[PDB]
Amino acid sequence: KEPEQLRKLFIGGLSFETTDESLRSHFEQWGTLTDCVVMRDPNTKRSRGFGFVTYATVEEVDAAMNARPHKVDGRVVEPKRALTVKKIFVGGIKEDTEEHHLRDYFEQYGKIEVIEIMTDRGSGKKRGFAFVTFDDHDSVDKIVIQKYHTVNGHNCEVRKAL
Ligand SMILES: CC(=O)NCCc1c[nH]c2ccc(F)cc12
């Protein structure tokens, strides 16, 4: 079983009338839920407007994220995997890595809007790193939890870029 942390979706922006049961019935459309909680005040029991769900598998998390936007009990909510940005730094690509290497690999994580292969300001030579900007943060979130990224035969360092 994948680590539980990687099977969780944290759901912001809930309707205050959403319950454990209604949040569960909604997100069970995209997989088996082993846990589903609406956060509430300990004294008033009034919703805090957010919660989380835990799927049985990471593929189920993916399915839920691919089904965004989610309207739950009449309100569009904001699910996120376990710093919300749309851009990554990709290091270690050396001088022989081109746009199409980066595109063919990273397009399978999300929709790419910008690829920027970095060159030396003085010489024009490639510096061996790049930035990739996507249309949505979940691509980056999937990317940076991987232990490894292999592109053009290179083991790359990938992190969020601000
Ligand atoms: C952004 C924020 O502060 N809350 C959402 C993320 C989060 C952190 N710890 C939790 C515990 C329970 C839960 F339902 C959600 C969370």
mmCIF file of N, CA and C in Angstrom, residues 11-20 22-23 37-52 72-73 75 77:
data_model
loop_
_atom_site.group_PDB
_atom_site.id
_atom_site.type_symbol
_atom_site.label_atom_id
_atom_site.label_comp_id
_atom_site.label_asym_id
_atom_site.label_seq_id
_atom_site.Cartn_x
_atom_site.Cartn_y
_atom_site.Cartn_z
ATOM 1 N N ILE A 11 -9.289 19.226 1.454
ATOM 2 C CA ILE A 11 -10.359 19.888 0.713
ATOM 3 C C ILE A 11 -10.678 21.199 1.409
ATOM 4 N N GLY A 12 -10.324 22.315 0.774
ATOM 5 C CA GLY A 12 -10.664 23.622 1.279
ATOM 6 C C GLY A 12 -11.919 24.180 0.623
ATOM 7 N N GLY A 13 -12.450 25.227 1.244
ATOM 8 C CA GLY A 13 -13.574 25.918 0.657
ATOM 9 C C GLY A 13 -14.900 25.202 0.771
ATOM 10 N N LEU A 14 -15.057 24.317 1.754
ATOM 11 C CA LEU A 14 -16.302 23.588 1.888
ATOM 12 C C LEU A 14 -17.454 24.511 2.256
ATOM 13 N N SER A 15 -18.638 24.153 1.780
ATOM 14 C CA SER A 15 -19.855 24.641 2.403
ATOM 15 C C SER A 15 -19.880 24.244 3.873
ATOM 16 N N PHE A 16 -20.313 25.169 4.729
ATOM 17 C CA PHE A 16 -20.440 24.836 6.145
ATOM 18 C C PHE A 16 -21.496 23.766 6.390
ATOM 19 N N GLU A 17 -22.370 23.496 5.421
ATOM 20 C CA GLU A 17 -23.352 22.436 5.598
ATOM 21 C C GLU A 17 -22.856 21.072 5.121
ATOM 22 N N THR A 18 -21.668 20.991 4.527
ATOM 23 C CA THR A 18 -21.113 19.689 4.174
ATOM 24 C C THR A 18 -20.763 18.885 5.420
ATOM 25 N N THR A 19 -21.095 17.600 5.395
ATOM 26 C CA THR A 19 -20.862 16.683 6.501
ATOM 27 C C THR A 19 -19.896 15.585 6.077
ATOM 28 N N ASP A 20 -19.402 14.832 7.074
ATOM 29 C CA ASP A 20 -18.612 13.638 6.768
ATOM 30 C C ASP A 20 -19.311 12.798 5.716
ATOM 31 N N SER A 22 -21.755 13.650 3.478
ATOM 32 C CA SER A 22 -21.952 14.198 2.136
ATOM 33 C C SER A 22 -20.621 14.381 1.412
ATOM 34 N N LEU A 23 -19.557 14.701 2.153
ATOM 35 C CA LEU A 23 -18.232 14.743 1.543
ATOM 36 C C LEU A 23 -17.830 13.365 1.035
ATOM 37 N N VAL A 37 -13.239 13.182 6.695
ATOM 38 C CA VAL A 37 -13.499 14.019 7.869
ATOM 39 C C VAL A 37 -13.768 15.449 7.436
ATOM 40 N N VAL A 38 -14.816 16.053 7.995
ATOM 41 C CA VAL A 38 -15.011 17.497 7.962
ATOM 42 C C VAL A 38 -14.509 18.047 9.287
ATOM 43 N N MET A 39 -13.600 19.025 9.229
ATOM 44 C CA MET A 39 -13.091 19.650 10.445
ATOM 45 C C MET A 39 -14.138 20.575 11.045
ATOM 46 N N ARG A 40 -14.346 20.463 12.355
ATOM 47 C CA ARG A 40 -15.368 21.233 13.052
ATOM 48 C C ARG A 40 -14.779 21.849 14.308
ATOM 49 N N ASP A 41 -15.420 22.927 14.761
ATOM 50 C CA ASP A 41 -15.059 23.514 16.039
ATOM 51 C C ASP A 41 -15.343 22.528 17.173
ATOM 52 N N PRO A 42 -14.437 22.396 18.145
ATOM 53 C CA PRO A 42 -14.668 21.426 19.230
ATOM 54 C C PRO A 42 -15.808 21.796 20.164
ATOM 55 N N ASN A 43 -16.189 23.072 20.256
ATOM 56 C CA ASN A 43 -17.247 23.482 21.172
ATOM 57 C C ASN A 43 -18.586 23.690 20.473
ATOM 58 N N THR A 44 -18.595 24.405 19.347
ATOM 59 C CA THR A 44 -19.830 24.727 18.644
ATOM 60 C C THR A 44 -20.273 23.657 17.653
ATOM 61 N N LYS A 45 -19.366 22.767 17.246
ATOM 62 C CA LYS A 45 -19.554 21.800 16.162
ATOM 63 C C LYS A 45 -19.774 22.464 14.805
ATOM 64 N N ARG A 46 -19.632 23.781 14.712
ATOM 65 C CA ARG A 46 -19.770 24.441 13.425
ATOM 66 C C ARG A 46 -18.567 24.102 12.555
ATOM 67 N N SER A 47 -18.840 23.783 11.296
ATOM 68 C CA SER A 47 -17.784 23.472 10.340
ATOM 69 C C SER A 47 -16.727 24.556 10.299
ATOM 70 N N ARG A 48 -15.486 24.124 10.122
ATOM 71 C CA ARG A 48 -14.377 25.022 9.854
ATOM 72 C C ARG A 48 -14.175 25.245 8.361
ATOM 73 N N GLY A 49 -15.006 24.639 7.519
ATOM 74 C CA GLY A 49 -14.946 24.926 6.097
ATOM 75 C C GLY A 49 -13.895 24.158 5.338
ATOM 76 N N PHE A 50 -13.306 23.130 5.938
ATOM 77 C CA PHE A 50 -12.338 22.306 5.240
ATOM 78 C C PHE A 50 -12.352 20.915 5.860
ATOM 79 N N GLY A 51 -11.738 19.980 5.147
ATOM 80 C CA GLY A 51 -11.667 18.609 5.610
ATOM 81 C C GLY A 51 -10.657 17.855 4.776
ATOM 82 N N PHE A 52 -10.661 16.530 4.917
ATOM 83 C CA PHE A 52 -9.814 15.719 4.044
ATOM 84 C C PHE A 52 -10.505 14.392 3.759
ATOM 85 N N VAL A 72 -19.322 20.588 -4.403
ATOM 86 C CA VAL A 72 -19.758 19.714 -3.319
ATOM 87 C C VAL A 72 -20.816 20.469 -2.542
ATOM 88 N N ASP A 73 -22.033 19.924 -2.509
ATOM 89 C CA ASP A 73 -23.147 20.556 -1.799
ATOM 90 C C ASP A 73 -23.328 22.007 -2.254
ATOM 91 N N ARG A 75 -21.133 24.170 -3.710
ATOM 92 C CA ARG A 75 -20.016 25.098 -3.651
ATOM 93 C C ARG A 75 -18.788 24.464 -4.292
ATOM 94 N N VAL A 77 -15.152 23.511 -4.418
ATOM 95 C CA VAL A 77 -14.183 23.339 -3.346
ATOM 96 C C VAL A 77 -12.782 23.277 -3.941
#
